[PDB]
Ligand binder design. Structure first.
Ligand SMILES: Nc1ncnc2c1ncn2[C@@H]1O[C@H](COP(=O)(O)OP(=O)(O)OC[C@H]2O[C@H](O)[C@H](O)[C@@H]2O)[C@@H](O)[C@H]1O
Ligand code: NA
Length: 373
């Protein structure tokens, strides 16, 4: 079979149901794919009905582009993606082991790790409440006549984050360690739209609700370091056995960065995981495919070997600028037209890896297996 993939795509049981309904609607001629999904379908040979659910899902995920800003560059009307596709893509997360080269500070605030540290990233798209065009799938889902609904937002983040929490619980267990997870203010910046001034407490409440509800499934998760940067009160509380900390590093001096061990954890006792505020439509690291070390997604990708994990190439970390650069051979000359998205174009890289679903018993399994049982 294929070579091992450094990255793994996960999704919830409810997202699998949406995928099955979509696949069946296409098979019956009730749905039209978006043009980008159609483009990826046309590069393989199978009809929708002949391909299986995992291949079908992979091809939809493959329609993502290296850099695309959901808040401003998407129409939601089939000329790019449809709302039915967007509902699915927003639920898909991706994890990968990484080397972390700095603590994740934005701009020039980053602090280099003397020795690069090992851990993991889990890219998860936030609730998309911004658009340069019409309303989004997430807006339809979590707003009632324009008002945010906490219970509906809770269910959305539950769908999106629980598969990764379950994954890293099991990974901590099999590594005979506990998990420390750093989390940013997902959805509270570029994705917040008109809700910028009110969204922050909703996200913190959603995280607390998911951890309270599922604590029995997360015995190897130990520390949750939630850093909304600004706009939430510093706090520490116990959620069952788990230490949940609200540590906004934009207002409090001397907080640990997203790509660093929170207080109480170290490499011998914990695996280190950071959630990344991702994008429905882009590859992990979005902005930084275009050379921009900007936003949680672009900063964390640039500050790790994310792009090496996705492309398979060996990049070179630049200490002065806090960013993992393309291979020296690619950068040497090239007219400076040599960022990672340029690398993708000339080497025909695609984003496509293994995908698993979280079944109703709390086990990650193949789409085929979950759908049948
Ligand atoms: N200087 C800073 N240092 C640290 N955190 C900061 C800083 N400035 C803002 N934050 C916090 O960073 C947190 C994350 O805000 P965002 O990165 O916009 O994420 P989203 O989920 O809303 O938008 C996702 C889109 O943005 C990307 O392009 C993706 O690819 C998507 O296209 C917030 O708490 C900020 O307050
Ligand atoms: Na609740």
């Amino acid at each position: 079979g294929p070579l091992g993939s450094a990255y793994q795509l996960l999704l919830s049981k409810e997202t699998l149901n949406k995928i099955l309904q979509y696949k069946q609607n296409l098979e019956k001629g009730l749905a039209t794919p978006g043009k980008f999904f159609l483009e990826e379908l046309s590069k393989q040979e199978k009809s929708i009905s002949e391909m299986d659910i995992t291949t079908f899902t992979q091809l939809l995920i493959q329609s993502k582009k290296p850099q695309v800003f959901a808040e401003s560059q998407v129409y939601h009307d089939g000329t790019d993606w449809t709302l039915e596709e967007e509902s699915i893509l927003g639920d898909v997360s991706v994890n990968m082991p990484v080397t972390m080269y700095n603590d994740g500070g934005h701009g020039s605030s980053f602090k280099n790790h003397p020795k690069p540290i090992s851990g993991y990233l889990a890219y998860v798209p936030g609730a998309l409440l911004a658009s340069g065009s019409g309303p989004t799938s997430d807006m339809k889902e979590v707003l009632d006549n324009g008002k945010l609904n906490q219970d509906k937002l809770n269910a959305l983040y539950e769908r999106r984050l629980l598969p990764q929490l379950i994954h890293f619980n099991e990974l901590a267990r099999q590594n005979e360690k506990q998990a420390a997870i750093t989390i940013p203010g997902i959805g509270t910046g570029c994705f917040s739209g008109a809700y910028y001034d009110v969204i922050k407490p909703y996200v913190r409440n959603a995280l607390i609700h998911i951890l309270e509800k599922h604590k029995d499934s997360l015995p190897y998760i130990d520390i949750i370091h939630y850093d909304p940067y600004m706009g939430d009160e510093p706090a520490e509380k116990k959620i069952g056995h788990m230490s949940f900390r609200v540590s906004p590093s934009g207002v409090v001096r001397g907080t640990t960065g997203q790509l660093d061990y929170p207080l109480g954890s170290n490499p011998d006792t914990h695996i280190l995981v950071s959630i990344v505020a991702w994008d429905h439509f882009s590859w992990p690291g979005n902005d930084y495919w275009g050379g921009a070390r900007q936003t949680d997604d672009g900063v964390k990708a640039a500050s790790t070997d994310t792009m090496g994990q996705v492309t398979g190439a060996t990049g070179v970390y630049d200490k002065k600028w806090g960013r993992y650069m393309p291979p020296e051979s690619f950068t040497k000359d090239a007219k400076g037209m040599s960022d990672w998205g340029d690398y993708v174009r000339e080497n025909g890289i695609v984003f496509n890896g293994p995908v698993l679903a979280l079944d109703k018993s709390g086990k990650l399994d193949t789409l085929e297996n979950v759908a049948s049982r």
